[PDB]
Amino acid sequence: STGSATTTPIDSLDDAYITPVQIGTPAQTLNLDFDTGSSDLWVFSSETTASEVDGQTIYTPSKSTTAKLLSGATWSISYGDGSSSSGDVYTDTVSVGGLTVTGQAVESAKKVSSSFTEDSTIDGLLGLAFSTLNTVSPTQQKTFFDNAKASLDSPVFTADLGYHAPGTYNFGFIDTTAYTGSITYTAVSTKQGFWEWTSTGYAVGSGTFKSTSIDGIADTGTTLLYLPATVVSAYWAQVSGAKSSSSVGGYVFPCSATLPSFTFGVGSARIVIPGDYIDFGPISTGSSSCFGGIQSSAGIGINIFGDVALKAAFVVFNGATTPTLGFASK
């Protein structure tokens, strides 16, 4: 089997991407943030504290003939930005772009933090990291991809995110019309539960390539590109007026600037992020200070190839027995 679904940015900055997901019988369609950096499928629901729901579409398990309480199971997760959610668990039928998993764990939120409440466009998250990160207790649950894997034509999914435009998540096949050139595959470590790999280096603008190993994760659920402070300083040094602002929380640059591109290495291949992809716009409405899309990973503890990086490529998440990541230009 295969599936294919369109993913759409939630706002004019590509802050996140939402993909429609069918849950239950009759189907309830919720727009979920597909997150290759976590492993929980959770939704706003009829159980979510009323004061914490503000415009989201909710999953109502009592209206699904295929929903079953997963008795005794609870979940609780926090994300790298400090947000969090928690609740109980149902199993139900879940379909993405025509691909169906029966008995998928659907984690129903009883509580969500303010950042989730405040984002009316995101109805939940669909985690696509390795199931070893799933937070359901006492019986850890599998991701949608892990459950679908055996049924897929090929044990892969692909992320083809758009720049200020819709994109595609495919499961079970590689769309050879969706990229240029060849896909370069690179080794994955699953030891931390992430799609963790090692980039071979970087270049800034038209500069020469610096060969240097950068361990990091491919994370569709993170907006920006987080790299070591040395790399990030070398990038922003090329932009007149750019500075790291403690009060804003990262590098800002004059909105009057044209940004250089940033290239990252995948083995012997190269992915070029256009400078425009690194512009996240005014720090506040009307400001002439703009927020940078390349930021330091110092104190995160891990480098993150988030959407800024991934949307410049066609990305293959190969979940074969020996997992790998593929990157192609597009």
Ligand SMILES: C=CCN(C)Cc1nc([C@]2(O)CN[C@@H](c3nc(-c4ccc(C(F)(F)F)cc4)no3)C2)cs1
């Ligand atoms: C070893 C150190 C790990 N440390 C915690 C840094 C990391 N962090 C992650 C993510 O937690 C998973 N991938 C990212 C993600 N963030 C979201 C999200 C968060 C908030 C909203 C809200 F604003 F609507 F609330 C929406 C989506 N979704 O995914 C972050 C992986 S590694």
